[PDB]
Amino acid sequence: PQAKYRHDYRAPDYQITDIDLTFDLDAQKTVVTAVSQAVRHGASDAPLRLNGEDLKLVSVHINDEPWTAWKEEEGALVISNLPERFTLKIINEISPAANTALEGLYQSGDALCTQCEAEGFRHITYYLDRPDVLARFTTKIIADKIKYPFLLSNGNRVAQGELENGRHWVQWQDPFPKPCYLFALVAGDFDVLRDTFTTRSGREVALELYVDRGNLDRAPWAMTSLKNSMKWDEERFGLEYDLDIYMIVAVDFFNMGAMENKGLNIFNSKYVLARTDTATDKDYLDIERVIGHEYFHNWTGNRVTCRDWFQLSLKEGLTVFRDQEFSSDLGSRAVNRINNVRTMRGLQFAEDASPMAHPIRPDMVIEMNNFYTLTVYEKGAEVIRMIHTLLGEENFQKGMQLYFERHDGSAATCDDFVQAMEDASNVDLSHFRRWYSQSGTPIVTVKDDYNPETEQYTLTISQRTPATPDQAEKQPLHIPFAIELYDNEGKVIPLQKGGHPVNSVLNVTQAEQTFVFDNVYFQPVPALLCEFSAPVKLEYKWSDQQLTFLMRHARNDFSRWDAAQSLLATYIKLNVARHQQGQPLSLPVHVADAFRAVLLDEKIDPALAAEILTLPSVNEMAELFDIIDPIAIAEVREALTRTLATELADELLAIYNANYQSEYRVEHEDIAKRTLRNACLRFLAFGETHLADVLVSKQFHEANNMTDALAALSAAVAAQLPCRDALMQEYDDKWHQNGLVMDKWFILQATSPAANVLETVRGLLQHRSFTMSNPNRIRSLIGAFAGSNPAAFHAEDGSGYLFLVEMLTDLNSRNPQVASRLIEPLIRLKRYDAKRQEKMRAALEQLKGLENLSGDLYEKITKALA
Ligand SMILES: CN(C)c1ncnc2c1ncn2[C@@H]1O[C@H](CO)[C@@H](N)[C@H]1O
Numbered sequence: 089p090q091a092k093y094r095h096d097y098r099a100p101d102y103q104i105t106d107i108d109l110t111f112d113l114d115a116q117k118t119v120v121t122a123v124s125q126a127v128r129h130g131a132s133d134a135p136l137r138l139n140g141e142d143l144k145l146v147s148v149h150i151n152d153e154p155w156t157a158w159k160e161e162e163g164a165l166v167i168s169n170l171p172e173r174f175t176l177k178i179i180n181e182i183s184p185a186a187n188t189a190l191e192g193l194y195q196s197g198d199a200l201c202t203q204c205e206a207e208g209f210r211h212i213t214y215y216l217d218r219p220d221v222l223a224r225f226t227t228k229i230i231a232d233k234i235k236y237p238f239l240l241s242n243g244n245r246v247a248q249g250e251l252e253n254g255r256h257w258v259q260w261q262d263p264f265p266k267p268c269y270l271f272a273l274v275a276g277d278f279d280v281l282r283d284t285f286t287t288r289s290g291r292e293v294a295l296e297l298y299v300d301r302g303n304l305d306r307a308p309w310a311m312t313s314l315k316n317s318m319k320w321d322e323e324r325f326g327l328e329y330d331l332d333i334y335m336i337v338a339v340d341f342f343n344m345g346a347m348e349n350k351g352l353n354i355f356n357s358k359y360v361l362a363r364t365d366t367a368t369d370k371d372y373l374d375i376e377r378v379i380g381h382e383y384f385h386n387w388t389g390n391r392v393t394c395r396d397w398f399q400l401s402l403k404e405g406l407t408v409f410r411d412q413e414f415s416s417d418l419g420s421r422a423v424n425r426i427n428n429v430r431t432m433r434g435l436q437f438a439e440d441a442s443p444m445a446h447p448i449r450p451d452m453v454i455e456m457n458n459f460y461t462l463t464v465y466e467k468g469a470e471v472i473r474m475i476h477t478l479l480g481e482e483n484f485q486k487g488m489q490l491y492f493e494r495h496d497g498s499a500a501t502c503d504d505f506v507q508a509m510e511d512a513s514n515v516d517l518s519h520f521r522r523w524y525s526q527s528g529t530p531i532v533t534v535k536d537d538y539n540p541e542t543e544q545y546t547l548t549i550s551q552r553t554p555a556t557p558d559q560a561e562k563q564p565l566h567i568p569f570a571i572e573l574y575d576n577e578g579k580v581i582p583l584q585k586g587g588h589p590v591n592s593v594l595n596v597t598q599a600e601q602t603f604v605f606d607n608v609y610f611q612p613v614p615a616l617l618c619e620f621s622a623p624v625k626l627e628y629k630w631s632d633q634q635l636t637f638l639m640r641h642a643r644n645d646f647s648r649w650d651a652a653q654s655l656l657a658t659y660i661k662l663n664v665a666r667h668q669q670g671q672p673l674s675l676p677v678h679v680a681d682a683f684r685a686v687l688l689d690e691k692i693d694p695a696l697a698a699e700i701l702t703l704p705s706v707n708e709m710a711e712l713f714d715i716i717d718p719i720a721i722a723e724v725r726e727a728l729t730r731t732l733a734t735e736l737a738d739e740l741l742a743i744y745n746a747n748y749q750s751e752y753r754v755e756h757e758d759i760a761k762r763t764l765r766n767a768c769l770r771f772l773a774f775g776e777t778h779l780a781d782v783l784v785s786k787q788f789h790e791a792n793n794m795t796d797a798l799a800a801l802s803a804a805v806a807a808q809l810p811c812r813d814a815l816m817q818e819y820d821d822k823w824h825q826n827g828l829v830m831d832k833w834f835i836l837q838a839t840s841p842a843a844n845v846l847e848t849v850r851g852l853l854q855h856r857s858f859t860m861s862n863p864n865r866i867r868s869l870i871g872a873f874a875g876s877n878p879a880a881f882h883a884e885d886g887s888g889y890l891f892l893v894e895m896l897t898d899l900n901s902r903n904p905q906v907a908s909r910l911i912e913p914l915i916r917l918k919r920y921d922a923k924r925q926e927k928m929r930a931a932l933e934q935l936k937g938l939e940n941l942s943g944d945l946y947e948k949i950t951k952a953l954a
């Protein structure tokens with residue numbers, strides 16, 4: 089498995105301009121005919137090197153001459169002695185039914201569908217499987233009409249026919265040149281929800297959502313959200329859909345979330361199907377965001393694509409930024425920002441502190457499917473957001489416009505995007521570019537001084553990024569550091585110096601620097617790194633009173649939340665140390681009082697209250713520590729919940745009841761109230777047993793929507809309430825035939841605090857609703873155990889590691905992409921104590937020795953074991 093390097097990019101020796109594909113479809117043996125029009129750009133003696141995996145080659149012709157000057161080698165078909173311009177014809181066979189990896193053309197239930205990103209098209213035919221080769225596709229699909237009445241590919245239908253022996257065919261054409269990773273094919277029997285969207289210039293677009301039979305009842309929200317996505321992109325970005333038909337297919341078997349194939353997106357059904365009894369508010373909002381994300385790729389990914397895979401963030405950072413802006417504009421901006429910061433600080437930072445650390449533009453990859461990461465996506469988006477902070481909306485949109493003017497219809501680079509933004513705005517991003525090439529989380533240290541004689545406030549700000557295993561050399565970044573200063577009534581102090589305004593985004597560009605502010609008439613309380621203005625760790629010696637002051641007075645909702653997180657972090661760290669000494673939780677009265685104040689403040693948005701009242705997750709807590717003690721973290725989190733539950737009991741029940749809603753609506757104010765209600769229920773579940781048991785069981789039985797039902801259920805499991813087992817069996821009895829709904833239940837099982845969780849999980853491998861053939865079930869049971877129950881995963885007996893090794897031993901062979909996601913918790917071994925580290929290393933060494941170890945796993949194991 090050889091590493092590939094960004095610096096080794098070279099333009100292709102050959103282009104393909106046009107490809108005509110024919111599929112004689114059958115689940116056991118599909119025959120692919122591919123007729124490509126090729127053009128040599130490189131040296132006249134260079135062979136054409138086509139990529140292919142697991143293909144049975146039938147024939148090779150060049151201008152209809154059977155060719156003799158070719159050879160197959162590992163991963164490749166190398167064709168020699170070609171003319172400058174020619175027609176290549178390849179016939180080859182593939183076997184969809186054999187494809188358990190779900191890469192290429194595969195079976196999902198009774199349907200046939202494709203996944204081609206990143207390098208899946210080479211599993212279908214021999215091709216230039218690189219995203220800087222852009223070709224015009226025509227696709228003819230021949231199949232059994234009964235089995236496959238719908239035959240879909242990108243674009244519009246150009247031809248159709250019927251054949252003997254019950255076969256029929258449809259031919260599609262997509263006018264826009266594309267890299268092969270955006271090819272899609274779907275064949276099956278579906279229900280179809282059909283609608284229309286008219287663009288702002290009057291183009292009528294046919295919208296078509298394909299779902300398995302009997303799922304139309306779960307389709308309208310996804311269609312609503314597609315329309316909302318299209319409107320928003322018009323309003324915010326000025327972008328309109330460019331084709332006549334927009335197709336989405338929801339499939340049950342899919343490794344990732346969804347896929348932006350031009351005009352024919354393919355979605356995991358998790359990110360499509362919803363009705364009020366099956367889906368929670370968070371499912372609704374995730375469908376919204378994923379529908380949006382894939383639609384936004386139509387411009388940022390498809391009309392402008394990636395020169396090479398190391399440029400992935402060019403489309404993914406920017407399309408995540410767009411999905412976040414879409415959700416934030418339609419819904420609660422602060423709740424969005426809060427949750428994206430929780431992901432950054434709790435999950436992304438862990439990656440950046442791990443053996444798999446990489447810059448948002450990687451330099452070295454073994455298996456590109458391993459680089460669809462929190463870093464490339466979420467840190468990628470933070471980097472785009474920083475450009476937006478530095479430029480402002482108007483200049484950022486001028487940059488977007490210049491980026492599309494220069495690069496529409498091409499495969500571009502991250503550097504191209506940054507150049508466009510610099511050139512449009514006249515903001516210098518030369519130093520800023522280091523964010524693309526440097527891995528790891530910068531640590532930003534802030535000291536302050538108030539001089540009452542001169543009425544000046546001085547911030548001394550330093551930065552450093554620690555080395556990471558991938559990069560021994562680090563340098564200072566251009567860090568946009570947003571501040572606000574508050575007087576003692578809570579009013580903002582104007583920032584100025586020498587008689588002139590100073591921008592509140594400080595440019596922190598050196599290892600150390602000072603910023604001096606004049607006409608500061610009162611000692612201020614600072615709000616620092618406002619709206620998480622750069623993806624960094626902040627070190628400032630906060631008093632508890634400065635933090636509770638911000639919770640009361642800060643102008644932006646995010647700051648109030650962030651101040652609450654800073655206040656809790658001190659006390660989480662205190663109590664983890666106490667747990668290690670066998671001492672009970674300790675929490676100052678004034679800290680509990682600040683959370684009481686949030687409960688009783690009628691002026692606070694409920695959406696923001698709910699988030700302040702949602703404790704940091706065990707992953708966020710782990711981020712606070714150099715060495716992670718997973719059992720201490722889990723138990724401290726429960727104890728902190730119990731303490732607050734006891735101290736705030738009466739207020740929690742008052743706010744619980746005050747936020748009752750008889751009508752269920754998927755509307756943002758209503759969601760906010762429900763999130764606050766259910767935030768209170770999490771604490772009330774740790775009340776006196778009999779009170780809690782009744783409250784939680786009542787909500788479970790009386791709920792008129794799945795948000796409320798699942799909140800109750802999750803509380804019964806988290807607090808090990810007497811009603812737990814009955815409620816859990818009630819749910820299984822009701823919902824066992826519905827795998828998406830059962831995933832919620834598997835997550836609850838896997839994340840249970842019960843002593844016997846591992847035994848329960850292992851027994852659920854045989855559950856009627858579980859199967860190792862379905863990525864969503866694997867994620868919901870096995871993934872949630874390893875990744876989201878770090879306490880049971882890191883059981884001192886080592887049983888959690890042994891369990892994961894067993895499951896990876898299967899998955900390595902079955903589905904290496906899912907295996908690679910699931911090994912992540914073992915690759916974090918150097919964050920744990922020595923005894924755990926030795927057990928985790930033994931597990932990794934077992935896996936390193938597997939027969940037929942996948943490249944996907946090999947990459948991660950060898951970084952981990954270094
Ligand atoms: C589809 N959208 C909205 C995504 N938004 C954010 N990250 C994603 C997405 N799709 C895939 N990813 C990334 O790939 C990984 C799957 O766990 C996630 N890390 C995620 O950040």
Ligand SMILES: COc1ccc(C[C@H](N)C(=O)O)cc1
Nearest residue numbers: 203205206343344346347348
């Ligand atoms: C291995 O299968 C896939 C790989 C990547 C994706 C992500 C999709 N482009 C997105 O950004 O949502 C989807 C599937």
Ligand SMILES: [Zn+2]
Nearest residue numbers: 381385404407
């Ligand atoms: Zn994407």
